[PDB]
């Protein structure tokens, strides 16, 4: 019958979707519902003519494009991605109105995009009754952090009464790369040390010890840790209360200019996208090659940082759209890291990403090196395969 | 004739001094003029009977002491710690009245002690108006950072026009310990890599490579990295947004309590002290564990990180209250950096820290961990001493 699955990720202004074959987890269709509670709301399905909303009516739409492609018969699951689980949920699970109830509980952790992940639970629901759903959440993963790993400096207050601690994100994609790198690395799960580099727009990275992550460098928000694209990435507090004083900002003014104007976009007042840097710092622009040197010497610290958390490192992984793209990054943040005795194979490290899961380092390296390409959709549909067989 | 140096130490309430011979750099006279600015202000010389008011009044009677003592004839030399130089201090200057001018220049990155260190200069030269008079600063030290490590990810406004980046403290501490690293574990300064976990009651990491300072885990103010006796350390900026929003605290507020209320303090909720903590634990008390836990879980975390500034690493070195004299901090830290192979030798790492520059680690480790007992007065004498050759 080639059963499918539909995997929906809404955001505070767009939903995004796949539909994935059960049996090999080929995406065969994808799509956008872009411009999200204004009045101008566009559906791009494959990347073709944009035809013109809440957010039911943007799944009503595509759910009877997928009625007029003839699939709605074929859904079998629905997978959606929740930005944030709190300490509630420790892994996939199948939706039921206890679950629902439970997301609701959390979603002041993360108030702009858990509303609207389960604006798209409230909708999915209503087009398709008959259909099992599943949530798979950012942050599940990065549960089994140890207290030592997670508490802030802050009173114990703050943590007991108001919940605040490290969470982490990236986490499905974290997982996911570490499932596939002790099949590239001929790794046992059970022992092994791992340190996974998500870099992308918002980047992240992971120490994955016997297969369970034990640290992570986005804190409570995914604010903190790396630089990024737009966001500071680690600020001394000290140093924002000393901004206050001489701008005469407040905390909420300080907290836009962190996410949305800081990063790499901050540095060097040209772009968050590296490919403009790069071409940027080769035709002599200093703050570019000054933002994308920090950018390294951050990755490079983290990375390193966060080998601490393991008793042996036997692979660094690199993921996300930087990860997996840029020759310069790796390169730089490899050759900053020669204290862990790195070694680099340049061609290697060269070739692009449609060799897919691939070895940059040399063999003399102590470590092995590798590119995996996340795909957090799959892992979805993965979960959501694997909750199909329940009896509930 | 015994020449000897005077070392002042102004703090924001008190005045700590110590007179050295200048060949020997042996300590002659210590002592506190403490309540300063209240009504009430104590001179305790040697620790025994305290005898009973601004800056000047302070450092008059401690000048009538040593007149009394007849010392005030063989003072050669007047060494001065400044909290905070800017970037216009690279290193221990003769006192001029472009210094001091120089000095109010960079003060408003320090309002609270830098006024108080300028407060005892006058003074001091109101006094002493023939001796030689020479400043040392915490910051000198990690003046030889490059951008890359001293840059926030905040947009370049911060860093060009309002000054913000990373200076990093203890330099003189981390200084004098890297100097007597070299001759201990028999290390060329210019081909070594060292970190120095400066573990005190404030607490910071610092990278020193070939000599020079790379990086070091306190930032703008001495809020970033470590966390400490009431100091946080590292903390996400998006949890400090969201706990305002929860609790209707402002950014000063969080400061106060980031600063005063956290680190060991807050998550124990009853010590800044490790002695105490450390029996609590034995007694069974579990917040006073998780608290040690953190603290231990974020030295490695940083020593790791600090270590990506390095080629190659050749010795850890402990220093500082904590440092020095805390068996189960050495212990518990040394085992969570397995993953840079240390090998800690439990005998020698028992040793009391009368036993001073000791070796900590056994024959295996792939790098040497030391203690080095750290002595910020002698190393303000040594700039005070060799800065006394100079003619101007």
Redesign the interface.
């Given at each position: 019958e080639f059963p499918v699955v539909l995997v929906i990720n809404c955001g505070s202004s767009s939903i995004k979707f796949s539909v994935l074959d059960v049996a090999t987890c080929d995406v065969l269709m994808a799509g956008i519902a872009d411009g999200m509670n204004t009045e101008n709301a566009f559906l791009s399905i494959n990347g073709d003519k944009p035809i013109n909303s809440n957010y039911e009516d943007a799944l009503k739409a595509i759910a009877f494009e997928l009625e007029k492609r003839d699939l709605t018969d074929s859904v079998a699951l629905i997978g959606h991605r929740i930005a944030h689980g709190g300490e509630l949920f420790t892994q996939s699970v199948i939706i039921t109105d206890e679950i629902i109830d439970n997301i609701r509980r959390v979603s002041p952790l993360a108030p702009l995009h858990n509303y609207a992940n389960l604006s798209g639970i409230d909708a999915a629901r209503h087009l398709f009754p008959a259909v099992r759903q599943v949530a798979v959440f950012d942050t599940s993963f990065h549960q089994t952090l140890?207290?030592?790993?997670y508490?802030?400096?802050?009173?114990?207050e703050?943590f007991s009464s108001?919940g605040?601690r490290?969470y982490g994100f990236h986490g499905t994609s974290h997982r996911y790369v570490s499932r596939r790198a002790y099949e590239l690395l001929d790794l046992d799960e059970k022992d092994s040390?791992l340190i996974v580099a998500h870099l992308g727009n918002g980047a992240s990275i992971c120490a994955v010890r016997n297969g369970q992550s034990v640290?992570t460098s986005?804190?409570?928000?995914?604010?903190?840790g790396l630089?990024?694209g737009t966001?500071?990435?680690?600020?001394?507090?000290?140093?924002?209360?000393?901004?206050?004083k001489?701008?005469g900002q407040?905390?909420?003014d300080?907290?836009r200019?962190?996410?949305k104007?800081?990063?790499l976009l901050?540095?060097?007042?040209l772009s968050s996208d590296l490919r403009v840097l790069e071409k940027a710092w080769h035709e002599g622009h200093e703050?570019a090659r000054?933002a994308i040197?920090?950018f390294?010497?951050?990755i490079?610290?983290?990375?390193?940082?966060?080998?601490?958390?393991?008793?042996?490192?036997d692979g660094i992984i690199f993921t996300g759209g930087i990860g997996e793209n840029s020759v310069l990054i790796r390169q730089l943040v490899i050759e900053?890291?020669?204290?862990?005795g790195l070694t680099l194979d340049v061609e290697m490290n060269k070739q692009p990403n449609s060799h897919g899961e691939r070895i940059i380092s040399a063999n003399p390296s102590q470590v092995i090196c590798a590119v995996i390409p996340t795909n957090e959709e799959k892992m979805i549909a993965l979960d959501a395969i694997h909750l199909g067989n329940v009896k509930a």
């Open positions: 140890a207290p030592e790993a508490l802030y400096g802050l009173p114990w703050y108001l605040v490290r040390g640290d986005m804190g409570m928000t995914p604010l903190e630089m990024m966001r500071s990435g680690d600020v001394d507090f000290g140093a924002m209360a000393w901004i206050a001489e701008t407040t905390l909420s300080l907290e200019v962190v996410n104007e800081s990063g901050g540095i060097s007042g703050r000054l040197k920090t390294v010497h951050r490079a610290r983290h990375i390193a940082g966060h080998a601490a958390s393991l008793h042996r490192l900053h890291l020669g204290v862990l």
